[PDB]
CSV table of C-alpha atoms and ligand atoms in Angstrom, one decimal:
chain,number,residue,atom,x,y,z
A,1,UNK,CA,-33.6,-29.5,22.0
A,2,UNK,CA,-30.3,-28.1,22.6
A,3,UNK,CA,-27.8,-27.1,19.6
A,4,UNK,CA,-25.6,-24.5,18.4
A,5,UNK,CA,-26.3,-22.1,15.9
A,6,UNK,CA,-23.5,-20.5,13.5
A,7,UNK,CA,-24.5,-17.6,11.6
A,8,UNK,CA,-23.3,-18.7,8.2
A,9,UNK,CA,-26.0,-21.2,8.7
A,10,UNK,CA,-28.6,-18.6,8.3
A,11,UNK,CA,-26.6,-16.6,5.7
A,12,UNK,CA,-27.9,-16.3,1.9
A,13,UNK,CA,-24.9,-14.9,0.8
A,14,UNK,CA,-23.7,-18.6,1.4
A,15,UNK,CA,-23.9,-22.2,-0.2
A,16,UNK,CA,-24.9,-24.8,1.3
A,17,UNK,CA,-21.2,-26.1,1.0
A,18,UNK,CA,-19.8,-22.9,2.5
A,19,UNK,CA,-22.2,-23.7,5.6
A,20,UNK,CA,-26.1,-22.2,4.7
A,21,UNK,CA,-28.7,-24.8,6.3
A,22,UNK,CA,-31.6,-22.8,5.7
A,23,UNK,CA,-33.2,-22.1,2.1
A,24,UNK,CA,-31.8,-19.4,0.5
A,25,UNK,CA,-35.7,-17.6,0.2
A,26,UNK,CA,-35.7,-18.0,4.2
A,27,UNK,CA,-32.5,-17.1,4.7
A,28,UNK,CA,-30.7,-13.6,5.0
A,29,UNK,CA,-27.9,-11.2,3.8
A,30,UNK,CA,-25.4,-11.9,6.5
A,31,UNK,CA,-27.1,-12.4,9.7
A,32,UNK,CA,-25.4,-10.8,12.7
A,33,UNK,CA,-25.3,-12.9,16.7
A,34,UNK,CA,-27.3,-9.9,17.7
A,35,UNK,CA,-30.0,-10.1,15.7
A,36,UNK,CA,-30.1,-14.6,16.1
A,37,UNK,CA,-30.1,-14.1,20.2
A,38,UNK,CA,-32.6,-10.8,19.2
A,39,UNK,CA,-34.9,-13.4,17.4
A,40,UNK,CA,-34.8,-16.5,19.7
A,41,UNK,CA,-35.4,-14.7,22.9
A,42,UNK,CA,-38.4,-13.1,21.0
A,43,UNK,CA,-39.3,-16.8,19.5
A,44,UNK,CA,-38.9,-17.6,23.6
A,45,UNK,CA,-35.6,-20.1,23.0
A,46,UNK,CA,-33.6,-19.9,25.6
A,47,UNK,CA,-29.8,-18.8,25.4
A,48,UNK,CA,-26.8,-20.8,26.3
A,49,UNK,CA,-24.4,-19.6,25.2
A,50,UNK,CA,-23.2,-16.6,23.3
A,51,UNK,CA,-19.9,-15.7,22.0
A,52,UNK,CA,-18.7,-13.7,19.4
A,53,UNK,CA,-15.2,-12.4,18.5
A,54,UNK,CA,-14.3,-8.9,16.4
A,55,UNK,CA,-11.1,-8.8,15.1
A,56,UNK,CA,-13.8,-5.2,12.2
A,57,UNK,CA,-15.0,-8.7,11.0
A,58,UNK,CA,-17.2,-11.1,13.8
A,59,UNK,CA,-16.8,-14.1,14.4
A,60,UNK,CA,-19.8,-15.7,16.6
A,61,UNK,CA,-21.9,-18.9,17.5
A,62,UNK,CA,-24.7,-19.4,19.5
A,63,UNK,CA,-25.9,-22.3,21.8
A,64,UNK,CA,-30.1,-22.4,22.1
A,65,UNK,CA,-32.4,-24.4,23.7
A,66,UNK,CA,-35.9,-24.6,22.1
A,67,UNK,CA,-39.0,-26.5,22.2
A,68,UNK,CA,-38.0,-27.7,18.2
A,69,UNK,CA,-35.0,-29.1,16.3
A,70,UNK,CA,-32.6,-27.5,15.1
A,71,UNK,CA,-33.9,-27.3,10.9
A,72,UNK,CA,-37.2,-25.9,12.3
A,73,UNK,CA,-35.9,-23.1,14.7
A,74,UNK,CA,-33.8,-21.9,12.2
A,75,UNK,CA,-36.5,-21.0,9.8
A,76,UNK,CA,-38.3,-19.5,12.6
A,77,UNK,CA,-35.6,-17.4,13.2
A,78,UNK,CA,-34.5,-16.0,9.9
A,79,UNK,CA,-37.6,-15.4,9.5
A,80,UNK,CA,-37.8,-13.6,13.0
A,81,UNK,CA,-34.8,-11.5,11.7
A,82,UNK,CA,-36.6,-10.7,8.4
A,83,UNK,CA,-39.2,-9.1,10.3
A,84,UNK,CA,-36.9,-6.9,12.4
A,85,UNK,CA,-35.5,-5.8,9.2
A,86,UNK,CA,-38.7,-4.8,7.6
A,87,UNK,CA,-38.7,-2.2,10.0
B,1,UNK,CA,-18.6,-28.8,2.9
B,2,UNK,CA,-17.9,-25.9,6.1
B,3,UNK,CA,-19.8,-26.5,9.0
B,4,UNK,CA,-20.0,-26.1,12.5
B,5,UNK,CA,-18.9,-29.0,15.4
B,6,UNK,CA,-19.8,-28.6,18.9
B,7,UNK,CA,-18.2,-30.7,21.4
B,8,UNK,CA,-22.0,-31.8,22.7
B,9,UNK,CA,-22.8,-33.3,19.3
B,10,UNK,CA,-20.9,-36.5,19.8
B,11,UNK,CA,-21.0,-36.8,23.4
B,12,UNK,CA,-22.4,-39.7,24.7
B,13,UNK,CA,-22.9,-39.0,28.1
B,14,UNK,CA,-26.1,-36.8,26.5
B,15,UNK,CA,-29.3,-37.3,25.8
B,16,UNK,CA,-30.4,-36.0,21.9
B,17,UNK,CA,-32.2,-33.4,23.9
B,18,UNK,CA,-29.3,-32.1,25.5
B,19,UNK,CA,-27.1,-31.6,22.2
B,20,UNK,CA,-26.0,-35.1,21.0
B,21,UNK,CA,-26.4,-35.9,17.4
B,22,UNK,CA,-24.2,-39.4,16.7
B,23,UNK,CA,-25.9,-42.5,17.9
B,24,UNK,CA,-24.8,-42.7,21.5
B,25,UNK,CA,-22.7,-46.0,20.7
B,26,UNK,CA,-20.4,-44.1,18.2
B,27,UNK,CA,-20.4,-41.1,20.4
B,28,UNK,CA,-17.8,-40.9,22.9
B,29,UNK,CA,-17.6,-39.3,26.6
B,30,UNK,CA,-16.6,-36.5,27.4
B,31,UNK,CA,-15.3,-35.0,24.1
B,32,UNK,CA,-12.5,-32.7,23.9
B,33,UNK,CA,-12.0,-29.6,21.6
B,34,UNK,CA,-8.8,-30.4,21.4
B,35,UNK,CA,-9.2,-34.0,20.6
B,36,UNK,CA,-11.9,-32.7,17.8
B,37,UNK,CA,-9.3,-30.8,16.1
B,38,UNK,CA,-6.5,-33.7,16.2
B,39,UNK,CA,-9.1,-35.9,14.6
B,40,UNK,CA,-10.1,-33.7,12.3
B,41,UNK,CA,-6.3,-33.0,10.9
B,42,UNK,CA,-6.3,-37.1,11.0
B,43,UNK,CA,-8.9,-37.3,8.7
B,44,UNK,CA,-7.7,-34.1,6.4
B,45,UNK,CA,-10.5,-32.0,7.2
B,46,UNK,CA,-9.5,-28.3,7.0
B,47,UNK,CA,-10.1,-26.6,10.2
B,48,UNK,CA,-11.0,-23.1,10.1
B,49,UNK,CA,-11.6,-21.8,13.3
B,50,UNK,CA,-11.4,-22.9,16.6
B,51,UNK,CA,-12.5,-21.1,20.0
B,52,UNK,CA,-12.4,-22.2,23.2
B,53,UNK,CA,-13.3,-20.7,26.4
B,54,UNK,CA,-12.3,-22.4,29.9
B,55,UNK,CA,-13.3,-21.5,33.5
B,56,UNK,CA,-12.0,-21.8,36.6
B,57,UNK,CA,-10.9,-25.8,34.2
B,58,UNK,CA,-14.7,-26.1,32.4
B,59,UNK,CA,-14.6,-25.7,28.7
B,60,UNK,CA,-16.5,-24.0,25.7
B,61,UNK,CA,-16.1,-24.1,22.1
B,62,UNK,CA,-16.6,-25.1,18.7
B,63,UNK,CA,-14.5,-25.7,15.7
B,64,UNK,CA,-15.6,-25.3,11.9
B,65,UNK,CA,-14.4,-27.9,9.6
B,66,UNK,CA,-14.0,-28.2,5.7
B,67,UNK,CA,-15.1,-31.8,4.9
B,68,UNK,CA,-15.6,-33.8,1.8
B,69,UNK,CA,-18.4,-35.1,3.6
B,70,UNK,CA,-21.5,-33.9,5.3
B,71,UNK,CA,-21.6,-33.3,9.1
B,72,UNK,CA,-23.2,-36.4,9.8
B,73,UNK,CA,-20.6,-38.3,8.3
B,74,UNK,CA,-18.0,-36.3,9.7
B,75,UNK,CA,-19.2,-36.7,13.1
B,76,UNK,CA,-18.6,-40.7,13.1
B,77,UNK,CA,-15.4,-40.5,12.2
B,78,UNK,CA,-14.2,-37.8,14.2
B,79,UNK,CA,-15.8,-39.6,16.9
B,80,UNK,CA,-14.1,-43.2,15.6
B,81,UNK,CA,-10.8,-41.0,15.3
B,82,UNK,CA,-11.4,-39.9,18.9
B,83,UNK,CA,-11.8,-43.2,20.7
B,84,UNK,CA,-8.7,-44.8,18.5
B,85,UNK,CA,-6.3,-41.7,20.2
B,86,UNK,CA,-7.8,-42.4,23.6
B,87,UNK,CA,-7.2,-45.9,23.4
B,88,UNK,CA,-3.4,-45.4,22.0
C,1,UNK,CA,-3.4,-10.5,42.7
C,2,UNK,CA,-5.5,-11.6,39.8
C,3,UNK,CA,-4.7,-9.8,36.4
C,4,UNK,CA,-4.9,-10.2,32.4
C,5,UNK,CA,-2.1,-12.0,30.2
C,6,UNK,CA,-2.5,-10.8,26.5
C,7,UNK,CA,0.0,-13.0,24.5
C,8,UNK,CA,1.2,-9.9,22.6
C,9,UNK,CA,2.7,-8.7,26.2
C,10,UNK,CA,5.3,-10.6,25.8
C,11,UNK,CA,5.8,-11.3,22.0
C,12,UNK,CA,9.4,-10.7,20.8
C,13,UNK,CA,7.9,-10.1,17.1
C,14,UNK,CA,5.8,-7.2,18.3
C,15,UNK,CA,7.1,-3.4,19.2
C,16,UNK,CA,5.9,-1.6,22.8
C,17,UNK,CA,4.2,0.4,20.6
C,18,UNK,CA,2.3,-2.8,19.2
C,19,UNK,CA,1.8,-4.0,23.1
C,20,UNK,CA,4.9,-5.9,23.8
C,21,UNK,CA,5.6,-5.0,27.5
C,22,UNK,CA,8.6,-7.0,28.5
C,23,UNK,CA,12.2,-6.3,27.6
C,24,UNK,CA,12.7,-8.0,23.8
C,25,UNK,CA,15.3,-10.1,24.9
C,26,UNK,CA,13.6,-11.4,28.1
C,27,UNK,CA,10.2,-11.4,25.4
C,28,UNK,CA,9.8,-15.0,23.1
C,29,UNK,CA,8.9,-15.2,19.5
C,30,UNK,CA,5.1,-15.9,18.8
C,31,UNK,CA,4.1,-17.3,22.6
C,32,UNK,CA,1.1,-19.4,22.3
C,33,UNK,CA,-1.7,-19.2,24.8
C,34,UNK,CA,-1.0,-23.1,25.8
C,35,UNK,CA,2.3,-22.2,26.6
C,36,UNK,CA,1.5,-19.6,28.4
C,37,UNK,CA,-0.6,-21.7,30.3
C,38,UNK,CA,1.8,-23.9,30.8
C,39,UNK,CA,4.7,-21.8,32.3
C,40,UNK,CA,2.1,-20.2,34.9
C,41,UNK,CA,1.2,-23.4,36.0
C,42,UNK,CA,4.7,-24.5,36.4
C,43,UNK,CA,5.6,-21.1,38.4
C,44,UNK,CA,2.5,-22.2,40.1
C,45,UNK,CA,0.2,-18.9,39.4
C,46,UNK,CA,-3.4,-20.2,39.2
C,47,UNK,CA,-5.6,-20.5,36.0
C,48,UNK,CA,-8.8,-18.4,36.3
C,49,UNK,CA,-9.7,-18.1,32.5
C,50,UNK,CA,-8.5,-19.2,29.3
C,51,UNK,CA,-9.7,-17.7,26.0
C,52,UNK,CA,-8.3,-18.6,22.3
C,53,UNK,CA,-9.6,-18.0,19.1
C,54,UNK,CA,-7.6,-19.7,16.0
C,55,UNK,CA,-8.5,-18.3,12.6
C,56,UNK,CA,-7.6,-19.9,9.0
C,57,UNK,CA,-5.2,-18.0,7.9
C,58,UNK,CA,-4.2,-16.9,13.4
C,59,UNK,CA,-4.2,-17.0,17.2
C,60,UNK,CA,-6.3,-14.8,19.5
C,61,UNK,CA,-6.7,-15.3,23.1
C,62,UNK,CA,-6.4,-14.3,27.0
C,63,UNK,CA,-5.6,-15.8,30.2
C,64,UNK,CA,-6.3,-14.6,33.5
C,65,UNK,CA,-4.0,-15.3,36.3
C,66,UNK,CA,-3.4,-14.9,40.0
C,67,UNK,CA,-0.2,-14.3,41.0
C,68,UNK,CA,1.7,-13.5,44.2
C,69,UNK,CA,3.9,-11.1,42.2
C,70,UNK,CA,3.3,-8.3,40.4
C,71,UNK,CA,2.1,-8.3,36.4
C,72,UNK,CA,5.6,-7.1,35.2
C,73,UNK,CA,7.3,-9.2,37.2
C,74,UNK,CA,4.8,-12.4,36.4
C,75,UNK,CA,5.2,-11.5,32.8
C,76,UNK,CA,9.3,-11.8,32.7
C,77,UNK,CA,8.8,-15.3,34.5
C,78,UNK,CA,6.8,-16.9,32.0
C,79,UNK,CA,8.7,-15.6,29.6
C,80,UNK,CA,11.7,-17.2,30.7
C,81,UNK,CA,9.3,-20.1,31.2
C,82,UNK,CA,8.3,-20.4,27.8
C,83,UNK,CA,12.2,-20.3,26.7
C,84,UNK,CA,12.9,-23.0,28.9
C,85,UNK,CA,10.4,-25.2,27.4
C,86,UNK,CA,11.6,-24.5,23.8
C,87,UNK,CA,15.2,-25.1,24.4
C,88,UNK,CA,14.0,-28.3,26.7
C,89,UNK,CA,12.1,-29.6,23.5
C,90,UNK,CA,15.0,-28.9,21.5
C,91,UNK,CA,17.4,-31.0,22.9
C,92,UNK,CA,14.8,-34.0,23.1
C,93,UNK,CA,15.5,-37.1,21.1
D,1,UNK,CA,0.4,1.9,22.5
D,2,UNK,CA,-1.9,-1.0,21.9
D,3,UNK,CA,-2.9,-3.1,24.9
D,4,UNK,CA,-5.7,-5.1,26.6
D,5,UNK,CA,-8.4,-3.9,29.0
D,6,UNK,CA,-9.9,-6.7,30.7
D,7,UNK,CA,-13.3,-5.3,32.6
D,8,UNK,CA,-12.8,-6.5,35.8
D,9,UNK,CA,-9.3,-3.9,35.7
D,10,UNK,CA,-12.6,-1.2,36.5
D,11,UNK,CA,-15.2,-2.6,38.2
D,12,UNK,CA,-15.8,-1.0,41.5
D,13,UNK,CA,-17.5,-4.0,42.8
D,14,UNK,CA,-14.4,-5.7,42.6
D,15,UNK,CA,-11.4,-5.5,45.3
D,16,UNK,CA,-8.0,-4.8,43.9
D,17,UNK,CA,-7.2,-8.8,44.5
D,18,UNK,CA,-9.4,-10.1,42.6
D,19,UNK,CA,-8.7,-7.6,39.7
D,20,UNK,CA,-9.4,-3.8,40.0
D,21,UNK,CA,-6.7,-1.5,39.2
D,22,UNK,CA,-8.4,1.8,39.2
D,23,UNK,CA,-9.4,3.4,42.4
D,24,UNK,CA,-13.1,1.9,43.3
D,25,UNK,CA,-14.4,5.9,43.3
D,26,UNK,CA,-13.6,6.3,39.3
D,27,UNK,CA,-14.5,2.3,38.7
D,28,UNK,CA,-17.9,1.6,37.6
D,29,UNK,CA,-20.2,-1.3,38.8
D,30,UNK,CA,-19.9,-4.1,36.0
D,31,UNK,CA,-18.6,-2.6,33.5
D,32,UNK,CA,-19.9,-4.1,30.1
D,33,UNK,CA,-17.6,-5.1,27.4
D,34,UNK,CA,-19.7,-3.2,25.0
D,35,UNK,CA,-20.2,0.0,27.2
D,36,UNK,CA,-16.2,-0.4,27.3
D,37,UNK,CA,-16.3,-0.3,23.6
D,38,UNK,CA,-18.6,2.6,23.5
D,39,UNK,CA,-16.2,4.7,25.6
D,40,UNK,CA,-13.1,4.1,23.7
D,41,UNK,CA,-15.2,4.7,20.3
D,42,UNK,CA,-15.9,8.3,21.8
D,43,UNK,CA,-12.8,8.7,23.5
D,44,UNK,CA,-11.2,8.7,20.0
D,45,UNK,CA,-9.3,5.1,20.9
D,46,UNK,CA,-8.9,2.8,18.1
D,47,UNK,CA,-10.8,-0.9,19.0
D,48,UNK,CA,-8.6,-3.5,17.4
D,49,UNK,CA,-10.5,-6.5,19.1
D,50,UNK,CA,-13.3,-7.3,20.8
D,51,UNK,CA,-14.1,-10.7,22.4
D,52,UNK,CA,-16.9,-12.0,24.6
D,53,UNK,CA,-18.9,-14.9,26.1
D,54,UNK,CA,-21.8,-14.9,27.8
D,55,UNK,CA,-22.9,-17.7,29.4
D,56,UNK,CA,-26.5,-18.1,31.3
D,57,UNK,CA,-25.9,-19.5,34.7
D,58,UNK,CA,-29.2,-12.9,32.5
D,59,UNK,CA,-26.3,-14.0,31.7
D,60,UNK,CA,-22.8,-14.2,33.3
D,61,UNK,CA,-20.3,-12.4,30.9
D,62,UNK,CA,-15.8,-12.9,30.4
D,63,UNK,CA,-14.6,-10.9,27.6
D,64,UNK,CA,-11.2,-8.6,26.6
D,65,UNK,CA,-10.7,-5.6,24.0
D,66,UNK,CA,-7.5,-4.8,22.2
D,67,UNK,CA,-7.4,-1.1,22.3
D,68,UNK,CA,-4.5,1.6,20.9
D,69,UNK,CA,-5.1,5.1,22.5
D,70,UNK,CA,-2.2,8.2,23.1
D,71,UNK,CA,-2.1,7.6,26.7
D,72,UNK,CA,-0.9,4.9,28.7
D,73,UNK,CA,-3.3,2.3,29.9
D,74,UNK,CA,-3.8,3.5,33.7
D,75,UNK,CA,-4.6,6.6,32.5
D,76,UNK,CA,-6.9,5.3,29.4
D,77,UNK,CA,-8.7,3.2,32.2
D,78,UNK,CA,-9.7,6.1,34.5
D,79,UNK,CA,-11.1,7.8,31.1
D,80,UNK,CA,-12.7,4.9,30.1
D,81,UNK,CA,-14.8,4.2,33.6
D,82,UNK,CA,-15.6,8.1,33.8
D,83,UNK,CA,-16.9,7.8,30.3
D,84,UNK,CA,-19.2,4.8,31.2
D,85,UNK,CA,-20.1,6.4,34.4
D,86,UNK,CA,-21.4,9.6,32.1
D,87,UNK,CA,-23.0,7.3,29.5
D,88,UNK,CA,-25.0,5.7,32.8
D,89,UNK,CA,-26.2,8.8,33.7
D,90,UNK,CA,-27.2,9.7,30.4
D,91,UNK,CA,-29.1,6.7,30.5
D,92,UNK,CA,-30.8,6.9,33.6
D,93,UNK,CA,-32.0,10.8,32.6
D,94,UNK,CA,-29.8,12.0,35.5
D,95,UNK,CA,-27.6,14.4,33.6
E,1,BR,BR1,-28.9,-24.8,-2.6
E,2,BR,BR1,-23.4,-25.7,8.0
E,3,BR,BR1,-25.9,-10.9,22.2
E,4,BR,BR1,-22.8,-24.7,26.3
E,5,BR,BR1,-17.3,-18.2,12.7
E,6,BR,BR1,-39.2,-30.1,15.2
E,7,BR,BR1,-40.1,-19.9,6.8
E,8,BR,BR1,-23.1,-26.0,10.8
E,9,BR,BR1,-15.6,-19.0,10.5
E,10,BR,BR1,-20.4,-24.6,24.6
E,11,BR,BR1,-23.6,-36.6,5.8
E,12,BR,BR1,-23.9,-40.5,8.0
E,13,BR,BR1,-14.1,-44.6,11.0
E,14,BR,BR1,-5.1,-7.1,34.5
E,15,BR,BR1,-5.8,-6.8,37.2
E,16,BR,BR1,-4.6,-24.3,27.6
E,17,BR,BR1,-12.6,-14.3,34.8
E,18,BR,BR1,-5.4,-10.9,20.6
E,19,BR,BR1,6.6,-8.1,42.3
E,20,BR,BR1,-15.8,-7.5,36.1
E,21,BR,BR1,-13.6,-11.1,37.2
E,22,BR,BR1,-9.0,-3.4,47.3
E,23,BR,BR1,-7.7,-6.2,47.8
E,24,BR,BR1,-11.9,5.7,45.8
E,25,BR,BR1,-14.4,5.0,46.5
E,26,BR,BR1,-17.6,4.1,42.2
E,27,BR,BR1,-21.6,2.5,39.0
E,28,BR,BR1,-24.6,-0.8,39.1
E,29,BR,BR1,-19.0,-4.2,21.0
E,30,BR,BR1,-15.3,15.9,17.8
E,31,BR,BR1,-5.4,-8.5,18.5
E,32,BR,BR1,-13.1,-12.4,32.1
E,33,BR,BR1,-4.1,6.1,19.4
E,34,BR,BR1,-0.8,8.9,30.2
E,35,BR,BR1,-2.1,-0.3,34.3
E,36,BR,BR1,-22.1,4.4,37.1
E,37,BR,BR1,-27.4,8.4,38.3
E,38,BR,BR1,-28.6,13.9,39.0
């Protein structure tokens, strides 16, 4: 459905009590919004919303809307994002 | 621990599909960002950032909260938090 | 005309050279982006966009405005706005 | 100095009411907060903030930088849009 996705979520730098979601295996060294709206336009989400401040540090969220919840199109996209990397 | 809240979580004038999470009878209408962040001080969750963007006024944002709970949890009682303000 | 209002414009705290633009004494200590809000909609310049980031640690933010006056001019009166409000919550109670 | 440059201050599609301060010749059609960004970067002007939310209706974009640059800000806005109007160019393989 519709949800938002914060990049710490994705982030195995993280915890799970400082905000990862995703297994830290799936997950990546600090994910960037551009490479999460990279991955779900590729995974064919669609994008909501973007925003993203730089104050340089970045601050950013990200509202999707996909054909899967929200657990399952995160893994889909770090996993997106690891493949970008590998190249 | 630190998560994310967006406003559409515990609104109940959406569907699951269109962002709500809470069961749609603890969910309230309509929710604020700035009612989020009141309940969330109420309850002694640490708010760590908060971004809002209004157009024209239509609103966007999300907050991220330091909870001794999970975000489930959390949600209810912000939500519960939220209806007790509106109803004063 | 329709133009930007960055907080620091009109920040007492903050040097020209750090992007106050109104005189210091006309300028208010730490203006906050609902206050500025606020005064414009009380001087009755209208609300296009409002944009705020508040980080744990603090504020960040925008607003555009239209206005029948000038920026420099706009800037002074909410200014003085926002020091009316403060001295008006002062005295409450 | 340090101030703001909101996009709309150069955007030739814009009338001066609703935002444009730069004459419409050296404004550039939609200037993009992060072609704004690039120009400063090469302009040697030191980006203190960027913000900016996009919103699908691709997308329709609102956003602000928090620059510091040796001239004053009309004059930093003229070399800004020329800069973006170069990149462009570049871009398009028209010199
Ligand atoms: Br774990
Ligand atoms: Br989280
Ligand atoms: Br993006
Ligand atoms: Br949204
Ligand atoms: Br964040
Ligand atoms: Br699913
Ligand atoms: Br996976
Ligand atoms: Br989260
Ligand atoms: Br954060
Ligand atoms: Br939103
Ligand atoms: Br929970
Ligand atoms: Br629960
Ligand atoms: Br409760
Ligand atoms: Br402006
Ligand atoms: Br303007
Ligand atoms: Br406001
Ligand atoms: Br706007
Ligand atoms: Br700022
Ligand atoms: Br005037
Ligand atoms: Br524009
Ligand atoms: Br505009
Ligand atoms: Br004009
Ligand atoms: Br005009
Ligand atoms: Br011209
Ligand atoms: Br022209
Ligand atoms: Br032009
Ligand atoms: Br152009
Ligand atoms: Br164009
Ligand atoms: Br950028
Ligand atoms: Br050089
Ligand atoms: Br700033
Ligand atoms: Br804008
Ligand atoms: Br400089
Ligand atoms: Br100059
Ligand atoms: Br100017
Ligand atoms: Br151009
Ligand atoms: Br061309
Ligand atoms: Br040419």
């Amino acid at each position: 459905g519709r949800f938002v996705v914060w990049p710490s979520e994705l982030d195995s730098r993280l915890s799970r009590k400082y905000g990862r979601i995703v297994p830290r295996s799936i997950a990546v060294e600090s994910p960037r919004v551009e490479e999460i709206v990279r991955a779900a336009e590729e995974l064919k989400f669609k994008v909501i919303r973007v925003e993203e401040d730089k104050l340089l540090r970045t601050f950013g969220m990200i509202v999707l809307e996909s054909p899967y919840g929200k657990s399952k199109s995160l893994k889909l996209i770090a996993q997106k994002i690891r493949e970008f990397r590998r190249r």
